[PDB]
Amino acid sequence: TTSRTPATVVEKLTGPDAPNNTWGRWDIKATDLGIMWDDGAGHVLTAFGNTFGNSWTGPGGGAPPNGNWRSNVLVRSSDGDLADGMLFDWAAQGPQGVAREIIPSKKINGVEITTIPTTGISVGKRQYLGFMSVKQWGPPGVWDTNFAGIAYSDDGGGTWKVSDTRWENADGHDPFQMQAWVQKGGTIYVFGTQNGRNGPASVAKVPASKLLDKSAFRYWNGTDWSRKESDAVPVMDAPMSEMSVQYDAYSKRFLMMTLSGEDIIMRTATAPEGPWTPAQTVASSTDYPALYGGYFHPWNKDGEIYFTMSQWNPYNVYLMRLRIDRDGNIIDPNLVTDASFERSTTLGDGTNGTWAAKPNSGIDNAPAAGFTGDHRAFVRYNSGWRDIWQDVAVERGAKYRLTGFLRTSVNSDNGFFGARTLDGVPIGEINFHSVGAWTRFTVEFDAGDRDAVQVFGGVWTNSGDIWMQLDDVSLTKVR
Amino acid sequence: TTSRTPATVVEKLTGPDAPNNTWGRWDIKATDLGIMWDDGAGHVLTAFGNTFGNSWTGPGGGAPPNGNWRSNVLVRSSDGDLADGMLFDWAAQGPQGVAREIIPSKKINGVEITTIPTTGISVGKRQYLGFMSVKQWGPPGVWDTNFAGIAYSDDGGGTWKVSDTRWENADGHDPFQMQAWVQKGGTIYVFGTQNGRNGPASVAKVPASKLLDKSAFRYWNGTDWSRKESDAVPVMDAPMSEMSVQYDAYSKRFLMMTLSGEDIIMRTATAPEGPWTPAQTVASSTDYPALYGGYFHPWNKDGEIYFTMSQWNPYNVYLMRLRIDRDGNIIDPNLVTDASFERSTTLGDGTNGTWAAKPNSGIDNAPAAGFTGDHRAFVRYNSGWRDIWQDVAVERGAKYRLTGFLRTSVNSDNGFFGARTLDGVPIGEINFHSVGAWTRFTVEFDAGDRDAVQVFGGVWTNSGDIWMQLDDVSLTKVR
Ligand SMILES: CC1(C)O[C@@H]2O[C@H](CO[C@H]3O[C@H](CO[C@H]4O[C@H](CO[C@H]5O[C@H](CO)[C@@H](O)[C@@H]5O)[C@@H](O)[C@@H]4O)[C@@H](O)[C@@H]3O)[C@@H](O)[C@@H]2O1
Ligand SMILES: CC1(C)O[C@@H]2O[C@H](CO[C@H]3O[C@H](CO[C@H]4O[C@H](CO[C@H]5O[C@H](CO)[C@@H](O)[C@@H]5O)[C@@H](O)[C@@H]4O)[C@@H](O)[C@@H]3O)[C@@H](O)[C@@H]2O1
Ligand SMILES: OC[C@H]1O[C@H](OC[C@H]2O[C@H](OC[C@H]3O[C@H](OC[C@H]4O[C@H](O)[C@@H](O)[C@@H]4O)[C@@H](O)[C@@H]3O)[C@@H](O)[C@@H]2O)[C@@H](O)[C@@H]1O
Ligand SMILES: [Ca+2]
Ligand SMILES: [Ca+2]
Ligand code: NA
Ligand code: NA
């Protein structure tokens, strides 16, 4: 939809330009999902779906025959400072220097083409990773699974076995093919969808210590929790996709994220069986085309909600953030209009929620041309100060955080990114020189005694033919 | 010298192709030294000299006018697993996304062209960083300093102040311009050289809590520790350079590392004042041209000696390792001859400590063409198995660790790195596909009942015009 996107892009976690350098360290050049859980020992484990190495070019998933296709890979983080990204400090390797597939697949189309992680959790000293055995793929949002399964590891994710526990997909409509686990107290709630993205979500619950025992599951049947899976009823209507569910102590609500139709949405509930509050836009397909996934970071707290988002054309995973109040309502949204430049192929005059720029400037538009999406802004010249800017309404006296991703021609020597008055006087800014990789810059400032500022990025071009590119600009209130 | 290099390259820590991606994270594209210390709070702080960003090309230090020249930068590590590299987890930034200069300099040639870190330590909750004020550079190994200073930080390296404590260099021959600190008991021993690389080392000591108080220093004069800096006599003869000293609990010895003439060497002592045992070669200029630095990692233990080494042409810092026994003798040296391919410009026949390869192959030779140095081996064809190999003498029944750095053309699909019998039967190997960045591969194997193996790397080349490059191959006994 054209709904506004409250969420902010924090970092590209995987693939080209990613700070993490998954490509260099582990031959993770392109991948998706980024399903996260707390390993019970001070770390976050993060699992990915179909992963490709050095020869991948994109756009999209898929690679040449030498693409080092693994159905899945796993990395670890110990990073508690998510505002500045999420550093991966380890990966399951084999050989060393290459992230290995941890849940094997046959890679025979129409039998089992791949095995894709869905959700993860730890109980005591055991890690568990839910997955789906994919028989074959159809058009977007459509695929067939053989079963949902569970792998486990007793050494923090170093080595894995596949358990015998499965939800078989007898008739293609089994409701627990694609799962999402949340633990509260001594109980794991297991949400499930059918294969693909056109069906509803169901829920079951199991004592945390009995996750591998299907007979210990009880299924919400609309009145109570019963033994038969075939009694399960939907708790959230179709259409729903891959899902993530987190218990947020701050708001005393379960939060659920999913791609529903076009957009990633969030709903909230005081109990897993519902009632689930109406969908709130997290990210729209207009701002983040061919987005999918959406998995909560397990160290979210205090109303700060970090999550991983996938996107088809760049075929890589981004860390995202949004904020909620104590009722689970999204607050302090990105106030920048058209933050990812995806909504227009030209510039405006900088007013009324449009971007402006000096000559020579425009929107580059091609598959995965953006930092995210297919669009980015540019400005280029060979004389004087050359910038890109947008007027943004603000609350006088409030403090703001401005983040954005930019890069320059190698011969760039002086650029700035920041906020200024509508008269052009800088309020807060930083100074960059030559920027190779897409790089996030971050500026926090007081809006002061005014109802609007101009967010901007630009380069001095006195020294030569110099360009800057820009994407995914966010202005959000600081609390 | 042409002496053999016992040390093994572990990882490139900074710059292009480094796993750490200091370039993308922090605009640390090229830099030197990598002076390390324990910050007292479970981390290693690492300081660097003159640092350049995105526009740097090399070879060597210096950059274009937009090269984001900083006199120094500082990163952090929490990494206890040095066998697979040293992950940096933070850098002192400003703006965020750019590692900043932490010790200012005037950058006026003949006054103060730069400020270079020399050594660091923590005492309680304070970090200290020694540095030299550089007035002007001369030819290699020669420069003039104004003084040695000490900067300090009370917030774990986040912010820095330059103290008023200085060793001034009125006549150019002050013996403590370039310091190396080591703490044992509550005493810091302060080793010192003149400016540049042609003089001897002296030693001073100070109670750890009084590092900033020059009146608390005592200076070894050959008979006792006295109050006057002018009484200090050499404890180690010229020529010596930048230095590192570590107290090794394993050997109950102080270890000293420095570039002495052409080679990085190590000496040992049971007391800081000496006597210092004769120089042992760590890395020779023949294998590692224009090497310098050599700083011990503070978490060295059990005889495993990790250290950082700089090298001019790639102008970046590498983690290295060697092993000692309980007497402080280097043991278990790299058994591969001409490990970095620098000693010859053409291939041999694989015997007598030479490299061989199948057509089309040779030694690439250009400034900073190596992973390290100017040389790397290459093999390239479009048919069959195409490899680079060397016969290496082994001890029957012993276990060995083979590491080496390689990369491939993007269209590579299947290569192997490992050890095999002289008759070509693999003993242990790994399988790689397409390798973009220089990447280290690691193989451990039993030599079994034989006293030679062939170490190799190669690519299958049926799928196209495929090449592999290879550098810094090491085979060392496992303990
Ligand atoms: C055919 C396909 C999907 O499977 C093969 O395996 C590789 C990719 O695998 C990753 O993709 C799976 C998810 O696939 C769904 O998501 C795609 C993108 O969705 C976004 O774009 C569409 C179009 O508007 C919207 O649905 C959404 O916003 C969609 O096309 C797929 O149905 C993961 O499970 C797996 O890890 C490729 O080599 C190849 O692609
Ligand atoms: C002029 C110089 C050195 O300083 C300017 O700032 C940048 C580089 O600075 C780093 O260089 C210093 C060390 O410089 C010495 O090391 C060089 C390399 O040594 C190897 O080559 C020679 C000959 O084989 C041997 O001494 C050794 O094996 C040598 O030329 C220098 O004297 C660090 O303190 C500093 O951070 C450049 O822009 C420029 O270079
Ligand atoms: O890949 C990086 C970006 O390149 C593409 O840039 C598109 C822009 O390039 C042209 O503008 C740059 C062009 O203008 C400047 O020179 C202009 C000359 O015109 C007058 O005669 C003189 O004042 C001046 O010398 C110089 O910087 C260069 O030649 C323009 O066609 C377009 O807007 C982007 O798509 C990428 O992001
Ligand atoms: Ca975009
Ligand atoms: Ca070399
Ligand atoms: Na972080
Ligand atoms: Na490591």
Numbering used by the authors:
A (entry chain A), B (entry chain B): 2 to 480
Reproduce passages from the article.
A complex-form crystal was prepared using a catalytic residue mutant (D51N) for the co-crystallization of A9LT. In the catalytic domain, the active site on the front side of a 5-bladed β-propeller fold contained a linear tetrasaccharide with an acetonide tag (A4LT). Unexpectedly, a linear tetrasaccharide without the tag (A4L) bound to a putative carbohydrate-binding module (CBM) domain that adopted a β-sandwich fold was revealed. The bound A4LT molecule in the complex crystal form spans subsites −3 to +1, and the arabinofuranose ring at subsite −1 adopts a 3E conformation to hold the α-anomeric scissile bond in the pseudoaxial position. The side-chain oxygen of Asp33 is located 2.8 Å from the anomeric C1 atom, making it suitable for in-line nucleophilic attack. Asn51(Asp) forms a hydrogen bond with the glycosidic bond oxygen between subsites −1 and +1, suggesting that it is the catalytic acid/base residue. Pro141, Arg198, and Leu292 form hydrogen bonds with A4LT, while Tyr293 and Trp138 form stacking interactions above and below the cleft. Glu243 is the third Asp/Glu residue in the active site cleft and supports the side chain position of Arg198, which plays a pivotal role in holding sugars at subsites −3 and −2. The activity of the D33N, D51N, E243A, and E243Q mutants toward A22BβT was nearly abolished, confirming that all three Asp/Glu residues are catalytically essential. The arabinose unit at subsite A is sandwiched between the aromatic side chains of Phe379 and Trp468, and hydrogen bonds from Asp365, Arg381, and Gln470 are formed.
